[PDB]
Amino acid sequence: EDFRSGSEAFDLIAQDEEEFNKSKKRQWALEDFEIGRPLGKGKFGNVYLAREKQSKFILALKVLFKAQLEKAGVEHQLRREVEIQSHLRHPNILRLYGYFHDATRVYLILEYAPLGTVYRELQKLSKFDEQRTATYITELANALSYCHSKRVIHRDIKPENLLLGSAGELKIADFGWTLDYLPPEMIEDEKVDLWSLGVLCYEFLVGKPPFEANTYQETYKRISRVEFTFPDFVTEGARDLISRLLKHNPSQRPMLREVLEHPWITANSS
Amino acid sequence: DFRSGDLIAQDEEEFNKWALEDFEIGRPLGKGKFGNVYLAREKQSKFILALKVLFKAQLEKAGVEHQLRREVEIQSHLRHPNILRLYGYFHDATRVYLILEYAPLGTVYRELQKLSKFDEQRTATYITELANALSYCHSKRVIHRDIKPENLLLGSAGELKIADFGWSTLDYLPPEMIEGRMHDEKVDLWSLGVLCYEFLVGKPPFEANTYQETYKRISRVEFTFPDFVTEGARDLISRLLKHNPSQRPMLREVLEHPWITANSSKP
Amino acid sequence: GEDFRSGSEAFDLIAQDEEEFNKSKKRQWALEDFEIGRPLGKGKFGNVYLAREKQSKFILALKVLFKAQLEKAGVEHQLRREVEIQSHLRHPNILRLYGYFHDATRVYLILEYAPLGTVYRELQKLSKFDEQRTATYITELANALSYCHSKRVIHRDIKPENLLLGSAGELKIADFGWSVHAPSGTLDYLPPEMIEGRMHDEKVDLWSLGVLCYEFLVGKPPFEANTYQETYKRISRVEFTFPDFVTEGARDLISRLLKHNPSQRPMLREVLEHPWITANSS
Numbered sequence: 001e002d003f004r005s006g007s008e009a010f011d012l013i014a015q016d017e018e019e020f021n022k023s024k025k026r027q028w029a030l031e032d033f034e035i036g037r038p039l040g041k042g043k044f045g046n047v048y049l050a051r052e053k054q055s056k057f058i059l060a061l062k063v064l065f066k067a068q069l070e071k072a073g074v075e076h077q078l079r080r081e082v083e084i085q086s087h088l089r090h091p092n093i094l095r096l097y098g099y100f101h102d103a104t105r106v107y108l109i110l111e112y113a114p115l116g117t118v119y120r121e122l123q124k125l126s127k128f129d130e131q132r133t134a135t136y137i138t139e140l141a142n143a144l145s146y147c148h149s150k151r152v153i154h155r156d157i158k159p160e161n162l163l164l165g166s167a168g169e170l171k172i173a174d175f176g177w178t179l180d181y182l183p184p185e186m187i188e189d190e191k192v193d194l195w196s197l198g199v200l201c202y203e204f205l206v207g208k209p210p211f212e213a214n215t216y217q218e219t220y221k222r223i224s225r226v227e228f229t230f231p232d233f234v235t236e237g238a239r240d241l242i243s244r245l246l247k248h249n250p251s252q253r254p255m256l257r258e259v260l261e262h263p264w265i266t267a268n269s270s
Numbered sequence: 271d272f273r274s275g276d277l278i279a280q281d282e283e284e285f286n287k288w289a290l291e292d293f294e295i296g297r298p299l300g301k302g303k304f305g306n307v308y309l310a311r312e313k314q315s316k317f318i319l320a321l322k323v324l325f326k327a328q329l330e331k332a333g334v335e336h337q338l339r340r341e342v343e344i345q346s347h348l349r350h351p352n353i354l355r356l357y358g359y360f361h362d363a364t365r366v367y368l369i370l371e372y373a374p375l376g377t378v379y380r381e382l383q384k385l386s387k388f389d390e391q392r393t394a395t396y397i398t399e400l401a402n403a404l405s406y407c408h409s410k411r412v413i414h415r416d417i418k419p420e421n422l423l424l425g426s427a428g429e430l431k432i433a434d435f436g437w438s439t440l441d442y443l444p445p446e447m448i449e450g451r452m453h454d455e456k457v458d459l460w461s462l463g464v465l466c467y468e469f470l471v472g473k474p475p476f477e478a479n480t481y482q483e484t485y486k487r488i489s490r491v492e493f494t495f496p497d498f499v500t501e502g503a504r505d506l507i508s509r510l511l512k513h514n515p516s517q518r519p520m521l522r523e524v525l526e527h528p529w530i531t532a533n534s535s536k537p
Numbered sequence: 538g539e540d541f542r543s544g545s546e547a548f549d550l551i552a553q554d555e556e557e558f559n560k561s562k563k564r565q566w567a568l569e570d571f572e573i574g575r576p577l578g579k580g581k582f583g584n585v586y587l588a589r590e591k592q593s594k595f596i597l598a599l600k601v602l603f604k605a606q607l608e609k610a611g612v613e614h615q616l617r618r619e620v621e622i623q624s625h626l627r628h629p630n631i632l633r634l635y636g637y638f639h640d641a642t643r644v645y646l647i648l649e650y651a652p653l654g655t656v657y658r659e660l661q662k663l664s665k666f667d668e669q670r671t672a673t674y675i676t677e678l679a680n681a682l683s684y685c686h687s688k689r690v691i692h693r694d695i696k697p698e699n700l701l702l703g704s705a706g707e708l709k710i711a712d713f714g715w716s717v718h719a720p721s722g723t724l725d726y727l728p729p730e731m732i733e734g735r736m737h738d739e740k741v742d743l744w745s746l747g748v749l750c751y752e753f754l755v756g757k758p759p760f761e762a763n764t765y766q767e768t769y770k771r772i773s774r775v776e777f778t779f780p781d782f783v784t785e786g787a788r789d790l791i792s793r794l795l796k797h798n799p800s801q802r803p804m805l806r807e808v809l810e811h812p813w814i815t816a817n818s819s
């Protein structure tokens with residue numbers, strides 16, 4: 001066996017330290033962008049409507065400030081979400097086109113959603129009819145089955161994290177989200193999204209979530225007891241789907257596929 | 271209707287919305303995992319307190335810096351006569367300092383080692399003070415993962431003080447992910463039971479030689495009372511050591527339990 | 538009464554204790570102590586090199602991990618944990634962590650060199666192991682695992698990729714990245730809801746041992762399916778079938794090892810003197 005001594009050697013490690021490339025995502029800076037009016041303000045920074053100077057492509061630029069990211073200590077959480085959302089392409093999932101950073105700032109290059117959140121739509125329309133609701137639920141189930149196929153579970157689905165494209169299509173935005181040898185005790189979930197889907201369908205039809213109370217403790221009480229009532233104008237299929245989705249035992253909750261097969265969904269989806 | 275080639279910088283600026291020499295140092299009160307505690311006095315107010323020095327080296331070794339920031343955030347915005355007060359914190363290179371309330375009578379662990387057992391008056395009084403501190407905690411939305419005699423200090427009047435704080439959108443979350451947080455405060459209730467037992471017997475009720483034995487006992491609520499544990503104390507502890515959390519009493523039911531009412535020197 | 542001291546004499550007291558606190562001894566390794574040879578493999582965080590200590594000329598492995606990826610993946614304390622565990626662990630069937638050191642950009646692990654590679658490799662080559670190789674591997678593994686448990690260490694990643702081979706083909710447990718420090722801090726004050734499904738014991742390993750035995754004799758693990766759901770379902774129901782060629786003593790040991798209820802699984806000494814093991818191993 002042959003061994004290298006000192007220099008010729010110390011150069012080996014520093015050569016392979018650079019053949020450790022990992023620069024394989026399009027490179028970006030702030031100068032590639034025109035900045036427009038603010039789309040929103042957040043806990044860690046601000047979102048601006050922006051344009052790539054070259055292509056004129058309209059988009060959203062989320063600036064997060066590394067100062068208040070180091071405070072709450074969510075850096076690696078953010079790396080997780082970013083690596084997730086970068087490798088994820090679907091018409092009902094808001095695209096992460098890219099990301100970059102300087103010091104004190106990390107920028108997220110995101111798809112622009114011109115029709116805002118489903119939360120604002122709910123605030124302005126008070127309630128949705130069954131066509132709009134079933135179409136939202138269909139797009140949601142599509143994005144969620146695509147997500148579950150990529151082994152990623154999004155379990156913070158809610159009208160504030162649902163944006164709308166130009167055609168009014170729903171788009172999931174937030175992503176805050178060994179085996180063959182593991183024993184039973186260490187491996188005993190996705191159905192959580194089915195529950196959230198039931199809650200969302202109810203809120204779309206009625207105007208508020210089925211367990212809303214003026215105190216959080218009362219809502220604990222209602223959720224644990226599955227205590228809620230349907231107003232008159234909620235139809236039977238709608239009632240049927242929402243009741244199937246809001247089962248206390250997660251393994252009694254249908255499969256997203258069954259949701260997409262549900263007769264109410266098929267009849268009302270646009 | 272826009273363009274650029276400053277704004278963000280502005281929006282950033284907008285988003286950006288103690289010293290050791292201030293103290294006389296007294297005798298050391300104890301040395302622990304990450305540093306030492308010294309008795310101290312404010313040079314200006316002549317107010318006695320304790321100064322905990324943690325050394326940033328081992329803090330970064332054990333990887334607990336964010337955990338410690340959380341500890342201090344929780345404890346500082348918390349003032350109750352049975353919770354050790356965090357007056358403040360500061361730091362220099364290689365050192366973080368905690369300015370804390372001074373507890374002159376030490377830990378309940380040392381007292382329990384000295385006396386082996388506590389009588390019923392002292393025990394029920396400790397439980398009263400603990401339940402008061404814990405109800406205040408739960409009101410400020412804070413659950414203490416582990417109260418235990420090593421984390422309980424004693425003030426000048428021998429009153430209890432909770433010192434450590436180790437592991438201290440619904441409407442869309444399913445029931446399986448709520449019960450936990452919905453009956454999460456009952457954790458403390460269980461611990462209270464355990465503590466009461468250890469206050470009267472001298473050792474906790476699930477003590478074993480191996481950790482798997484202790485797991486088995488805790489999961490099955492397998493424990494026995496010695497002779498000298500009286501009727502009402504057995505009742506309180508048995509109420510508190512219920513396997514199902516919702517079957518455990520409320521803190522205000524503990525504070526009104528007949529045994530506690532009869533034997534406690536505090537309201 | 539209490540006495541309080543101001544000025545220099547006070548701060549020097551804290552300073553003194555600072556100096557007395559420092560109580561952490563380890564040998565001061567450096568890159569200059571090593572002659573580097575050909576690469577042995579690549580990893581998520583760096584490269585393994587065949588290396589030699591300058592003075593002894595003693596041959597070993599030098600695993601270089603780059604702090605950049607360690608910081609990105611947020612695995613720094615996980616690595617510190619696994620290094621602490623593997624360092625204070627000396628057994629003939631456990632790959633030896635001679636030491637570790639670091640410089641900005643790099644942390645180096647000085648490791649025992651295993652010249653015959655991974656058991657995963659040889660299972661790929663031979664597709665299946667005969668009962669003699671299998672029983673011998675299980676014997677060496679049970680020895681290493683009983684040593685691990687006795688020093689309060691639950692490895693949790695028993696698998697052919699984590700098993701290396703010495704110059705004589707003897708087994709070496711290699712990756713301690715999921716390994717954990719067993720309890721005994723106390724559980725005396727923990728309620729049932731915070732230890733039932735969230736806290737295990739060493740029986741984990743026993744289960745894996747079973748799996749491994751199966752995979753040694755059959756070619757694939759016994760709960761293999763396409764996606765997690767199926768495999769999870771099979772594991773939770775302990776649904777597996779033996780091929781016809783698996784002899785009955787092997788079936789007995791694997792069925793004893795793969796029990797849903799942890800404390801029903803045998804103890805390592807029961808495995809080591811199981812009749813099949815005794816008959817087929819050295």
Ligand SMILES: Nc1ncnc2c1ncn2[C@@H]1O[C@H](COP(=O)(O)OP(=O)(O)O)[C@@H](O)[C@H]1O
Nearest residue numbers: 039040041042043047060110111112113117160
């Ligand atoms: N890609 C986008 N397109 C259009 N509007 C957006 C986009 N991202 C964010 N917004 C607006 O900014 C607001 C706040 O979003 P932000 O703070 O970034 O995320 P979070 O949902 O975590 O609060 C949203 O309510 C939305 O109206």
Ligand SMILES: Nc1ncnc2c1ncn2[C@@H]1O[C@H](COP(=O)(O)OP(=O)(O)O)[C@@H](O)[C@H]1O
Nearest residue numbers: 299300302303304307320370371372373376377
């Ligand atoms: N505020 C305080 N008042 C009096 N004694 C204290 C105080 N804080 C710590 N001590 C002493 O230090 C010891 C506990 O040290 P501490 O740093 O709290 O433990 P740990 O380092 O394990 O968290 C006890 O013996 C106790 O007497």
Ligand SMILES: Nc1ncnc2c1ncn2[C@@H]1O[C@H](COP(=O)(O)OP(=O)(O)O)[C@@H](O)[C@H]1O
Nearest residue numbers: 577578579580581585598648649650651652654
């Ligand atoms: N101590 C060793 N002796 C000989 N070869 C080794 C040693 N450690 C690793 N190798 C080889 O180098 C490769 C890299 O392995 P390793 O870095 O341990 O995997 P990972 O980075 O996934 O933990 C392995 O596939 C193995 O073939």
